[PDB]
Amino acid sequence: LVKVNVLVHGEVVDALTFIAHREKAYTMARAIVDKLAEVIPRQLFEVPIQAAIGGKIIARARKDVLAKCYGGDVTRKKKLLEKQKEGKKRLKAIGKVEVPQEAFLA
């Protein structure tokens, strides 16, 4: 029966996982795990909430300023491209919570 869990950037997530018996691990993985996407996205980080059932992960479930200095500089584009790129590393980390549970449970 084991105890198939799940993963979601954070940890422990809502409150799933039971007992994956008879390959039942991935059996429902591509099902429940792929919970659409919590209906709500919250931010543009795109956290990857996998399924820490008991591995070894299993399941596998941003402003637009860049184009404004138009017509040139595959240079300066990059300059302003890194600015926000740094936030992600400082966001997902500092941006505690990021847990939008209590959606539909499906």
The least distance separating RNA from the CB of residue 68, rounded to whole angstroms, comes to 9
Site residues, RNA (CB under 7 A): 42-44, 62-63, 65, 80, 83-88, 90-91, 94-95, 97
Please tell me what DSSP assigns to residue 45. Answer: -
Task: Provide Rg for the chain, Cα atoms.
Answer: 18
**Cβ closest to RNA, residue 24 vs residue 92:** 92
The least distance separating RNA from the CB of residue 15, rounded to whole angstroms, comes to 20
- With a CB cutoff of 8 Å and minimum separation 6, the contacts of 30 are 59
**Cβ closest to RNA, residue 28 vs residue 84:** 84
The least distance separating RNA from the CB of residue 35, rounded to whole angstroms, comes to 19
Q: Report residue 83 as tokens.
A: 């600015």
Q: Report residue 2 as tokens.
A: 């084991």
